[PDB]
Design a protein around this ligand. Structure first.
Ligand SMILES: [Zn+2]
Length: 257
C-alpha cells in the first residue's frame, strides 16, 4: 500500500490513484511575487473556543488529533469560504532534518514541518460526503520552523511515546488547538486536493503566511514515531510529505498587501 518510501512513495501514488496527475493537486509552491492580493477576500474566522478533542491516533503515515465533529463547535468560516466548515482532525507532515518537511513551499523554501487542520463543509452533512465535492473541505495549513518551543504543542509531544507504532491510539481530551496558531491570520488561498491518497480534489487551501516556532526537542519527538506496527522492523516516521505539484490552471490569492 502507499506510503513515503522509494517503492511506495509519492512518485508511485498515481498507479492506484490516477487523480495524482490531476488538474488541482496539492501541495504547490507559493510564488509570493505571483500571488495576487485580493481585496475581496475576508478575514479568516477561526472559532475554536468550544473545540472538543477526543483522541490521538498513529495511522501509519502521521498522527491525527481528532475532534468531536457531531456538533458545531470548532468551525472555520470567512476567508475565501462560503458557509461553515467543522474541524474533524489535525495532523502534521515533517522531515528527517529541519531543512525539509513542509508540503507547501514559499518561493521554494521548505519549512521543517506543516500543520494541517482539516474541516468539512456542513452543507454536505459528513466528511465522507464532503470529500466528494469540490468545495467539501477547508484545510488550514500552518508552517513550523525550529527555534523557540511552542508551549501549546507540548501536550501533543508528550503523548507520542504512547502511540509509537501504527494502529495505536490514546485518549486525548481537552486539547486546545488555539495554542497552535500564529499571531497573524494573513493567508494565501487556492483550490486543491488532499495531499494523501485518495488525493481527492475537494479542498480550499488556506495557508498562513506566518510560521509557528517549535523547538528542536519537540520536532525530534515527532521523528521518534514509527510508520511500522508494534514489533515490526523499525522505520522512523520521517519525511511524510508530498512534494509540490504543478500549479496548472490555478491562481493563488493573498489576503494581505
Ligand atoms: Zn496533511
Amino acid at each position: 500500500h502507499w506510503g513515503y518510501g522509494k517503492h511506495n512513495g509519492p512518485e508511485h501514488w498515481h498507479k492506484d490513484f490516477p487523480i495524482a496527475k490531476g488538474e488541482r493537486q496539492s501541495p504547490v509552491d507559493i510564488d509570493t511575487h505571483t500571488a495576487k492580493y485580493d481585496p475581496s477576500l475576508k478575514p479568516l474566522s477561526v472559532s475554536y473556543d468550544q473545540a472538543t478533542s477526543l483522541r490521538i491516533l498513529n495511522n501509519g503515515h502521521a498522527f491525527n488529533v481528532e475532534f468531536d465533529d457531531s456538533q458545531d463547535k470548532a468551525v472555520l468560516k470567512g476567508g475565501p469560504l462560503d458557509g461553515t466548515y467543522r474541524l474533524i482532525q489535525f495532523h502534521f507532515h515533517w522531515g528527517s532534518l529541519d531543512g525539509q518537511g513542509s508540503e507547501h513551499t514559499v518561493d521554494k523554501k521548505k519549512y521543517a514541518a506543516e500543520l494541517h487542520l482539516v474541516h468539512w463543509n456542513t452543507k454536505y452533512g459528513d466528511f465522507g460526503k464532503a470529500v466528494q465535492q469540490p468545495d467539501g473541505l477547508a484545510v488550514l495549513g500552518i508552517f513550523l520552523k525550529v527555534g523557540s518551543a511552542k508551549p501549546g504543542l507540548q501536550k501533543v509531544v508528550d503523548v507520542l511515546d504512547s502511540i509509537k507504532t501504527k494502529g495505536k491510539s490514546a485518549d486525548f481530551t481537552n486539547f486546545d488547538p488555539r495554542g497552535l496558531l500564529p499571531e497573524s491570520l494573513d493567508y494565501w488561498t487556492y483550490p486543491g486536493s488532499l495531499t494523501t491518497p485518495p488525493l481527492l480534489e475537494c479542498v480550499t487551501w488556506i495557508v498562513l503566511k506566518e510560521p509557528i516556532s517549535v523547538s528542536s526537542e519537540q520536532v525530534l519527538k515527532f521523528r521518534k514515531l514509527n510508520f511500522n506496527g508494534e514489533g515490526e522492523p523499525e522505520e522512523l516516521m520521517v519525511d511524510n510529505w508530498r512534494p509540490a505539484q504543478p500549479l496548472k490552471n490555478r491562481q493563488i490569492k493573498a489576503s494581505f498587501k
